[PDB]
Amino acid sequence: SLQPPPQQLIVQNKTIDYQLNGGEEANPHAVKVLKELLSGGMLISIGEKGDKSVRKYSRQIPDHKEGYYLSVNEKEIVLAGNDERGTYYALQTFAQLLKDGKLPEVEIKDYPSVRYRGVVEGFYGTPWSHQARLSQLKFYGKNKMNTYIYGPKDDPYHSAPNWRLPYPDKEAAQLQELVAVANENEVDFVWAIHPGQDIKWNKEDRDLLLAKFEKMYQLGVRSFAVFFDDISGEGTNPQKQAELLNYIDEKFAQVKPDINQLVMCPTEYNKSWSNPNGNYLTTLGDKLNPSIQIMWTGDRVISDITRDGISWINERIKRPAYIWWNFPVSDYVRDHLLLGPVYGNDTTIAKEMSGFVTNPMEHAESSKIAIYSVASYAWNPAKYDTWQTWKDAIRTILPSAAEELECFAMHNSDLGPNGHGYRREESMDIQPAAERFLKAFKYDKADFETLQYTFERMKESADILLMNTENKPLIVEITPWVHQFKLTAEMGEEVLKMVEGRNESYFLRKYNHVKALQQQMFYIDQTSNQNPYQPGVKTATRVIKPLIDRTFATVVKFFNQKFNAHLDATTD
Template identity: 50%
Template sequence: MTNYKKTLFAGIAGVLMCSNLYAQETNFDLSSQRSEKQDVLPVPGRKIDHQGLVINPTPQKLSFIGNEKLDISQGFILKDKQKKFTNDLNFVIFNKNGAKLIVDFGKKVAEKQKVKDVSGAYALNIHKNGISITGYDERGAFYGIQTLRQLLESPIAVNKQLPYLEINDYPNLPNRGVVEGFYGTPWSHEVRMSLIDFYGKFKMNTYLYGPKDDPYHSCPNWRLPYPEKEAKNIKQLIEASKRNRVDFVWAIHPGQDIKWNEEDYKNLVNKFNWMYDLGVRHFAIFFDDISGEGTNPSKQTELLNRLTDDFVKVKGDVSPLTVCPTDYSKLWADPTEKGSLAIYGKTLYPDIKVFWTGDVVCSDLTKETLDFINSRIKRPAYYWWNYPVTDYVRNILLQGPVYGLDTSLTKKEVCGIVSNPMEHGEASKLALYGVADYTWNIAAYNALDNWERGLNELMPNARDAYRTFAIHSCDTETGYRRDESWETTTFRLANWTDEAARNLEREFEKIENVPAEIDKGCTNQNLMKELHPWLTEFGKLGTRGKRAVELTRIYRTGQNDTLFWNKYIQNLMSKEDRKNYEAHKSGTMKLQPFYENAMDDMAHEFLKHLTGEIPMDYKGIGSFGNSSTTQTKLMLDNDTTTYYTSGIAQKAGDWIGVDLRTIREVSEISILQGRNSIDDVDYFDHAVLEYSENGNNWKALTGELEKQYVIHWNGDPVKARYVRLKRLDSKRTNYASVRSFEVNPLHAENLGFKLETEDRQQALYAFDRNLGTSFECSESIVFEVEKGIKSYILLTNRLSTPLKCKQLDAKGNLVSETILDSPFSKILLENKNVEKIRIEGTAEIFEIIAEKE
């Protein structure tokens, strides 16, 4: 459902203007679904001392009976009254001399134990006569067994004794589980089987099978039966689900190419019959992320009702259908009586469950969003929570707490919740541990405590290292933001304190050691395989963060420019470093920004110290939530293959610009909007270019700019510190992206001296007063010596071989030759006859600084 694939259509706004069009007609822009909020709210709850007793989900009622304990050192003697649960108790030792364990279920016995008349409810009692588990139904007794299993795994049972207690427990919601509905690589069969066991252990009862990249789930092959191997796998998934008392719900996604005729109706019924023969008894139909005639809500409800009559009721053992409507988010849903949701409410059979993602695609579960949807579909919605899914940020691994879910809800407002996880199934378990807890006992849900317990569940032998990784691997950076690194305080160069630096340094040292500790302690090899690429980059982040703190200490002494520069370049990320980090990010909210800001701040101040002038390393600014972050550097990096993106929908008054750091004369501005200059949807299609000296009073440099990806302004110089591109009236709701934002770009003719090299345009970066840019010199660079210059400072990256520096007179004769073997070199002019400097060799040159007499 979280479809962020790039499309070339006109946009959602134009669709919603026309009441006779459905929400995802042919011109619907699927990329406009990406309008998530960027509010970063703190994690609610607190860590609790459970005194050795850990049960997930949190029971509705648990009472200790005195201080006595039951001896279980001899194991158990089982009395399985319904002959159903022997295979579910493989975690206990059976012994005729053991403590009694009675398992039973049924309405009559449950009523005697005051078990709530809800599927999944149970009572578990531990007393002097042994342990009794009574379920309202078979599923309830199974859940009681899972609670016993967790009791035995808890520290409280380490001495083979269990305290006398009574548990009376039941789920708040009838549908609790997972939808495999993400885009990207589907889970392996092994991971699916592992996850089903996980669902059962933590009392989740629903697994919706609907991977978008399964060709037999979606078009074009939804009409065809599964091949033999895939069909065998599905049968095994169904069998595993039965063992874990999980409803395996098979979903089909036919809407993109379905024809509303008898032929396709028969195709659908045939597919359902094939799946029924494989063992499927629960079915769903997804009409999400489609365009064309398949979006017709009247046809959708007609189909669902007919399937209910012809298939569900005829079979007799098939549960009511579930549907994902095309209008699954308030972001584009038509709220009127003519809208798709209202049509669902008026025409769809009342027992068919209807999915909803909330105000936007990835959003919090609130009473307000449920009021909106329920009033239209005339039933409690089925919440499809797009968390911890990362198909829109596949370089992120979400390991943070589960929160953003209203804890006052009941089944009257929401009939169930399913989580759409990451393509990394094992790594999704930490979040699913929280979803299981919330959906079972909503009012008691404690997000932070659940997360602390979940860490131990997933990695008991390396919990602390896993916690360090997880607390710094929470945020999506764009889109549905999550709090991250909330126990870590970072700072800017100007706000340095020794104590803050020591604390941060210790945290980076911990981070540096995490990969080795998890590699040693993690026993789940599939989880380790998923985590490994992120752990590798996480350890590197610890190293460069620690070095940044050390480097700042050196910088603050101000005693040795050579030492500082040598240490500085040692801690720079190479292109390969950046590529690897971008592919597997963590620490995006505080840790990596600390590194980036520390290095940038020191570079700025160091260059200012060397030149006596304010450097030209401009800063990105704007109206979006991430405008003050390091992401804006992507439009200032002289690389048009990278881009800054707003991460949320553009709206009236939004703008993107640069801070020139001081008032300067501005005579030229060049901007590349969008991710390309041909057909991208993420740009301001109606805008104006403005400037300001103080950031408050803005003046226009251009007239209204209509649908311009490439913007170039030349004119009489104006005095400005701030320049921006401002959005004017527009129906566009896409993100805004900028590949390049150049103010007073440096040209060779403006240097004031002659320059000779293999790539003169690139060589300008060696003279642009910006240490964030560089020139890759592969042969040589020759530059004319200006009058009044006594020396030059050459700042390079690490040198693989020494450079030759030749000083030449006006005729090109050699005046002197020296070897430069240090990244920080000072070139003293031999005499006044020196007209040119020639530097020979291979080097990345950050800056060549002229020093006046």
């Protein structure tokens, strides 16, 4: 593939296996990438629109911010951005074209449909590690995400109680390194502050917030945000919030030479928690300076963005909303991994959105499946392909065991019932066999074979993933769920042996094995990931676990009828 898919692509059926024109005037971040690809004469022209190197191609460069033209043929290679970030993006597409020292002959004109695209590290729970964030930034660069908003709810220097204090030295030098890596990867590091729970609407707190921003600025930070989500009391006043942000804008963002994004998260950040008899959102829309972004999570705390939904907000805030999409964040279903495809967001509303960022799981590597897909969606939503992008994400993250990770992820998709009413499809490949088998049973051999095949594949996938060393941090994240997933598949297998139950003693051996396996699952659920909120480890919960639990109860019923016995048919 190419990921995100370019706006315009023309491929000829020739392949190609140098002089460098523009290396001293082009984006050094792009030139570095080219040289890193070029350990190894025909022209390579690199530059931004305006540079001498690419004058001949200025009609070909899209007149869009972050746009670029890329051309490969026998004679020469052109890598020409509308601006510095666009040249870097040309190189990111170039890097994907180059397979085994060879290139296809291609012409591409590309640019993003959504202006700001990325990740908000904005969840409750253990914030990502420094090394996880370093890896994230590089991944964002490769996938043309230009935005990283730093706002972990549990960072005491971001929120309660120490938002007024500078970071200690160790954390500051870490943030400084994050900013430098972000810069090198063309990502805006957006430092967010979350003051609303205890802010006073006086000059002293106003001044402390600006002094904090100044210290962040000294660490290299050039984009800023103020979050007013999940607070009560005086900090919720929209007139004062807008005055404060307008003051930050006028006294700081319009005084520095180089500040990029200024963003706020509103107290009412979704439709369903908006007071319909209040004027909160219209006050912000009317009073907030027009260059300041306003975030929005959709119709509900957790939701996908619809045309009607984006219309409702935009009418009120008098600008296109900056989407905070609450997926794959799992901080309210901490016992689940959410590794499914990214879907449900309207692909025709790019013009109606200023930005689109994903709030991910506290599991940084595992979040890359969704992050890669959100990158692809936000760059070219018109051509967003849910399932193919999901597969592409997985192959990128774990090429040495991609089919095994697809298997594990297909069955670790749903959230289970939760206080936000948000669910995802899961296990749809086997859901037909599951329902056709179980209805008959309470059956087509092809359906029994599908179930059998599925359990066998789950075990192969679990054992290969456990021992994979290509992405150790990913495996460390998911290991407890992989163990539980393997136990699930073993239990399925033993239940299907009970169905095929040949004699009474064999059936009783299977029955005792199933009970032992239930106990081990309970053990894992009681000893791994024992967080205060949703402790434990749940996996394959939507389709698979219920099919096994129900089939077990059904076969046992059937056994007790047959032998006038009283075996326990419970499943919990």
